[PDB]
């Protein structure tokens, strides 16, 4: 019945520690895959906006500034940064 997922990338203990940092001490099997999936979607969302800025500036390099303007559009995470 039980099965161990393979991967390259973000390890179970890193995910256990991220959960713990938020006060969550016990996570189910699906939380591991969900955490990787949510992480990827969040990064896609930020990078989509960042690249929109990069292309607007006619650059081929995504700058930290592009990422800031993008992050400010993703809700509460960086809310209030820069004033």
């Amino acid at each position: 019945k039980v099965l161990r997922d393979n991967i390259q990338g973000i390890t179970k203990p890193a995910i256990r520690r991220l959960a713990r940092r938020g006060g969550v001490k016990r996570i189910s099997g699906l939380i591991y895959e969900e955490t990787r999936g949510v992480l990827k979607v969040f990064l896609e969302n930020v990078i989509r906006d960042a690249v929109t800025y990069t292309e607007h500036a006619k650059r081929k390099t995504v700058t930290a500034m592009d990422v800031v303007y993008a992050l400010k559009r993703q809700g509460r995470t960086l809310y209030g940064f820069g004033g």
Binding site: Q8, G9, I10, T11, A14, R17, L18, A19, R21, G22, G23, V24, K25, R26, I27, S28, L30, I31, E34, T35, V38, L39, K40, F42, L43, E44, V46, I47, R48, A50, V51, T54, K60, T61, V62, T63, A64, D66, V67, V68, L71, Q74, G75, R76, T77, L78
Partner: protein, 98 residues
């Protein structure tokens, strides 16, 4: 009140940001590889300032931790329970975003 060290050559606001970098939980090589994985789907000719990767990582870890904080705050039982996908989702609806 503990004595505070203020370097003559570097501002503490710089030190604090370097300190936070060392506190990040996701290994940096897999992190940058995940950015690469995403970037490949957009454009093969995209480059990223190193500082941009770091900003992405700091914010992304905060985003994940806050999802767990919210779930934690919505979870009230006398005996400790394991968190499932449904718990994250509900907490997000109660306390979380959009």
């Amino acid at each position: 009140k503990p004595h505070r060290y203020r370097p003559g050559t570097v501002a503490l606001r710089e030190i604090r940001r370097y300190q936070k970098s060392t506190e990040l939980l996701i290994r940096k090589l897999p992190f940058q590889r995940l950015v690469r994985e995403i970037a490949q789907d957009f454009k093969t000719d995209l480059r990223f300032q190193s500082a941009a990767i770091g900003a992405l990582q700091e914010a992304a870890e905060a985003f994940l931790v806050a999802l767990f904080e919210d779930t934690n705050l919505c979870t009230i039982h006398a005996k400790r329970v394991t968190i499932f996908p449904k718990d994250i989702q509900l907490a997000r609806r109660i306390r979380g975003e959009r």
